[PDB]
């Protein structure tokens, strides 16, 4: 810059190249992040802790950038994830290679607004033909097989090797129970890792699953009022004082006698007010415990920050530490309170069932949490994939077979129009192409062997690649007619939100 003014981080080289180059590098790790994966991404964190994952939303929040073009798009990937489930892997990798094609139009001498409006015409026409590429629907969400048929693609988008057992097991853990007529738990589906009983022994436990060990006897009734407290019970140890190690031990005995009668009355006042279960986010006192067994009130030894807030939501309680004799302001909601041994661990089970107010919670059993916290990431987008808020989800070809189905239409539509928007419609059909080119390079063959066939097959909907030999040499894998499905809505937003982000980040030069 010629003068003292004009502080900016973009310009003639940097806006044309480096903004797209920054969006290239974020999309560089997402080349194999949707669909079949051999790709894995180890991360040490701002917590500096070792984790490997394949969800970009975990990766991109660890990633930081000063490029606002690179910074903006990961918010739009969240907007698809807030709306539908998996496909947040797709939003970055679609828009990333989209913008790389826009550089080539800027190599020729095309105006940016011609490139801006070029994908916009292509965005609308593709959204017209896209519901004509609806090939199925979830006609029976109560069926386990039709539910599991959708889920195998999103779990594959984390790992191909666990797509089939989990898609059954999630339907066995019943996202099926939601009619989806405005019914979807977002935190009463919260996946509960149980360490041990390795990952194929992961199980089903409807209603709220608490890993914390059940202390005392079981509740007096399953219809009990649930009292959820932040720290009602304590545990005593101390050290040297202002003058070291206080002058007597008599007041230590005098403070210990009232402490027992304090927690005697705390379990008594809960028993008086109607609540027959207490939730302790703090530790368990021994003097509190032996009166709780006679009062037949079930106790939880300890709870974390996430345990209380789900109870304050689902049951409807208020979390506060009771240094007073507690009264019921918590209004117990669940009519069934069980104890189960999941992973051979005392597991608190709360349960109630309603039409559009049910609870059904994913539980996992695996011998390693650092494996199982990534397996739940395959579950996390899969449950939100059920949130299409419709029974018939208008199922499209899974895997990415719709992309070559679309790309045939768009470059044909791009040829018919005139203009300099004319070229960017043709480059928009190329943006469908880049993802299976990047997936086939993880399959084990070149892209031109693969992408020749998927254009040559025809308008078919079925022909695609997995991670098999059929993916490699013939490039024909039934990613529609072998239990591999995707929905219309997740495909609709991920094309939409990647378009509006990439058009936005292209205009800026500052």
């Amino acid at each position: 810059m010629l003068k003292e003014g004009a502080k900016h981080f973009s310009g003639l080289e940097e806006a044309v190249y480096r903004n797209i180059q920054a969006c290239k590098e974020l999309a560089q790790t997402t080349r194999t992040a949707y669909g079949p994966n051999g790709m894995n991404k180890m991360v040490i964190n701002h917590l500096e802790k070792l984790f490997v994952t394949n969800d970009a939303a975990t990766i991109l929040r660890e990633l930081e950038v000063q490029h606002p073009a690179a910074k903006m798009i990961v918010m739009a990937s969240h907007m698809q994830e807030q709306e539908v489930g998996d496909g947040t892997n797709f939003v970055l990798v679609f828009a990333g290679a989209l913008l790389e094609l826009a550089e080539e139009l800027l190599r020729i001498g095309l105006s940016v607004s011609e490139v801006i409006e070029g994908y916009e015409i292509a965005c609308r026409k593709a959204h017209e033909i896209l519901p004509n590429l609806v090939c199925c629907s979830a006609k029976n969400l109560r069926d386990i097989d039709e539910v599991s048929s959708l889920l195998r693609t999103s779990i594959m988008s984390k790992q191909y090797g666990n797509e089939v057992f989990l898609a059954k097991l999630i339907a066995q853990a019943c996202v099926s129970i939601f009619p989806d007529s405005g019914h979807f738990n977002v935190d009463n589906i919260r996946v509960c890792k149980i360490l041990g009983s390795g990952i194929s022994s992961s199980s089903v436990l409807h209603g709220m699953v608490f890993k914390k060990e059940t202390e005392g006897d079981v509740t007096s009734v399953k219809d009990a009022k649930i009292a959820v407290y932040s720290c009602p019970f304590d545990g005593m140890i101390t050290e040297t004082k202002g003058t070291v190690l206080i002058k007597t031990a008599e007041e230590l005995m005098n403070f210990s006698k009232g402490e027992e009668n304090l927690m005697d009355a705390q379990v008594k006042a809960i028993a008086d007010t109607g609540a027959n279960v207490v939730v302790t986010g703090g530790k368990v006192a021994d003097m509190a415990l032996h009166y709780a067994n006679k009062y037949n009130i079930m106790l939880v030894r300890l709870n974390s920050k996430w345990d209380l807030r789900r109870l304050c939501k689902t049951v409807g309680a208020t979390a506060l530490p009771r240094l007073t004799p507690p009264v019921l302001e918590e209004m117990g909601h669940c009519d069934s309170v069980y104890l189960s041994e999941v992973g051979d661990t005392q597991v608190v089970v709360f349960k109630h069932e309603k039409e559009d107010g049910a609870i059904s919670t994913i539980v996992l059993r695996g011998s390693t949490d650092n494996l199982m916290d990534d397996i739940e990431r395959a579950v996390d987008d899969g449950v939100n994939t059920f949130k299409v808020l419709t029974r018939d989800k208008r199922l499209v070809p899974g895997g990415g077979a719709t992309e070559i189905e679309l790309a045939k239409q768009i470059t044909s539509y791009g040829e018919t129009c005139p203009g300099l928007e004319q070229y960017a419609i043709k480059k928009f059909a190329e943006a469908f192409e880049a993802i299976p080119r990047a997936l086939a390079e993880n399959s084990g063959v070149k892209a031109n062997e693969v992408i020749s066939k998927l254009y040559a097959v025809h308008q078919e909907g079925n022909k695609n690649v997995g991670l098999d030999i059929e993916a490699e040499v013939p490039a024909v894998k039934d990613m529609l007619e072998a239990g591999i499905l995707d929905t219309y809505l997740g495909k609709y937003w991920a094309i939409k939100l990647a378009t509006n982000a990439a058009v936005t980040v292209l205009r800026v030069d500052q």
């Binding site: 810059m1 010629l2 003068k3 003292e4 003014g5 004009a6 502080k7 900016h8 981080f9 973009s10 310009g11 000063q66 606002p68 073009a69 910074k71 903006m72 918010m75 907007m79 807030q82 709306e83 105006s111 940016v112 607004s113 011609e114 300099l420 936005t504 205009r507 800026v508 030069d509 500052q510």
Partner: protein, 514 residues
């Protein structure tokens, strides 16, 4: 440090180049969006001629002055500040060549003056007295919004824009100090934007459906505490005397039940029945056992209200603040015609329309709660400030370059001041006018020379104000396109350009001082 004979002029004009060059694609629908992350170190999406100046951490003294000069233009016009940046560096370009040939800046400044008032003479000649009908107000509001945002977003917003300014004609106001409240709705799509004649209250009264449909609203905009903080003090805060602090406790619980009983006497004082409603807007939270008891009496009681809403509800609807609920007549309170609790997002957003006096009209935009919601906030703001000028003047002109070549035809060909000293400054002045139509079309693909020869012929052929189509690159007539500028706006950009051009031209030393 000092700046001598050539350099002090040179730094000023060279900075005006790249300032104009970076701020090129910011005017009209060809005008591209811009981001700042170097103004505050935050992800910011910003578009205006003035606002981009205020955010960037500029150190060149000329752009700091233009940020002061265009502020006076932005107070009246809004958009047009990015129009002013384009013509300054172009005006400095031609006169510097005469100084590059060797010429005083003051004789060109002398030629800058009489060239200006001929254009000012031409502005009365080229002004087109149109009506201030809604569709004529739409065409001003279309080109104002498409400058900053998309056209698909513009036309949805243009529906909400042109109706509020017709409501301020009911107050006979040519300007816009009220009806300009931009309220934002939690959404994920900014494709939707609702227009409410009255106000929008942003809360939902913890025990809902107290009275969600109020046909006869008698509004009380107060901030009465019902969850009262109870303290025992002997020092202004907590003190060690346990004997002293105990006696204050018995009066602390008597305050909460005091304010509950005052609500009951006020409902029978105002209404007398439950057929006529009564609305309490509390700026603070209300007891839910009070929200149960007030709901049965025929009262809706909104809580935790925003302090910005506290004054504006008093202006249009009414209702003054107290710390009691004493027996008040409906003369002391205001009125609203219709109250409805609307829900979108994690908060309830109670609509309150058809006021005691519909003096303020709330512009409720929806959006994904991003900087995009911020980008549509100042876009409709400059949308309202542009049509503010439309109610000011009587003459709405086809702009976008239609006046620009039309001035330069009369300036060059007809010497106004035929003495050669001032016509030198006319030549720099008329060539300054060309920069707006020629380069935005050249950005569109049809380069600057094809655009100029078309619009100079056609306007000299027709006399009809042919502008430039910024989406093809070729001149099309702006009277039918609907890219229009006001008589108020086009004068000031001519005014603000010239005065800030001459003084920086007439420097010879820029010295470090203080």
């Amino acid at each position: 440090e000092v700046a001598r004979a050539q350099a002090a002029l040179a730094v000023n004009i060279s900075a005006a180049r790249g300032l104009q060059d970076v701020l090129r694609t910011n005017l009209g629908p060809k005008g591209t969006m811009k981001m700042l992350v170097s103004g505050a170190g935050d992800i910011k999406l910003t578009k205006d001629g003035n606002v981009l100046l205020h955010e960037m951490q500029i150190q060149h003294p000329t752009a700091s002055l233009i940020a002061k000069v265009a502020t006076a233009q932005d107070d009246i016009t809004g958009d047009g500040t990015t129009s002013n940046v384009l013509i300054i560096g172009e005006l400095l370009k031609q006169a510097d060549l005469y100084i590059s040939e060797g010429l005083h800046p003051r004789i060109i400044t002398e030629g800058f003056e009489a060239a200006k008032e001929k254009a000012l003479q031409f502005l009365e000649e080229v002004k087109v007295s149109r009506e201030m009908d809604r569709e004529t107000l739409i065409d001003v509001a279309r080109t104002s919004l498409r400058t900053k945002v998309h056209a698909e977003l513009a036309d949805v917003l243009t529906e909400a824009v042109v109706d509020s300014i017709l409501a301020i004609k009911k107050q006979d106001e040519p300007i816009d100090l009220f009806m300009i409240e931009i309220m934002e709705m939690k959404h994920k799509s900014e494709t939707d934007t609702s227009l409410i004649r009255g106000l929008v209250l942003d809360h939902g009264a913890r025990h809902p459906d107290m009275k969600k449909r109020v046909e006869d609203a008698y509004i009380l905009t107060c901030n009465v505490s019902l969850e009262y903080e109870k303290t025992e003090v002997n020092s202004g805060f907590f003190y060690k005397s346990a004997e002293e602090r105990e006696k204050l406790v018995k009066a602390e619980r008597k305050f909460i039940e005091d304010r509950v009983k005052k609500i009951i006497e006020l409902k029978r004082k105002v209404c007398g029945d439950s057929d006529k409603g009564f609305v309490v807007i509390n700026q603070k939270g209300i007891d839910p056992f009070s929200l149960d008891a007030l709901s049965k009496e025929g009262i809706v009681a909104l809580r935790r209200a925003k302090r910005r809403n506290m004054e504006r509800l008093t202006l249009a609807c009414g209702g003054v603040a107290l710390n009691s609920f004493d027996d008040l007549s409906p003369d002391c309170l205001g009125h609203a015609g219709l109250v409805y609790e609307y829900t979108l997002g994690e908060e309830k957003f109670t609509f309150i329309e058809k006021c005691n006096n519909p003096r303020s009209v709330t512009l409720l935009i929806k959006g994904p709660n991003k900087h995009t919601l911020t980008q549509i906030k100042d876009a409709v703001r400059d949308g309202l400030r542009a049509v503010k000028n439309a109610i000011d003047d009587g003459c709405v002109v086809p702009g976008a370059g239609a006046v620009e070549v039309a001035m330069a035809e009369a300036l060059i060909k007809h010497k106004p001041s035929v003495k050669g000293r001032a016509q030198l400054g006319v030549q720099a002045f008329a060539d300054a006018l060309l920069i707006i139509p020629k380069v935005l079309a050249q950005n569109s693909g049809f380069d600057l020379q094809e655009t100029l020869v078309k619009i100079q012929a056609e306007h000299s052929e027709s006399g009809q104000l042919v502008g430039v189509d910024l989406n093809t690159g070729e001149p099309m007539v702006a009277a039918e396109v609907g890219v229009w500028d006001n008589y108020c706006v086009k004068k000031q950009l001519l005014h603000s350009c010239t005065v800030i051009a001459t003084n920086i031209l007439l420097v010879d030393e820029i010295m470090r001082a203080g």
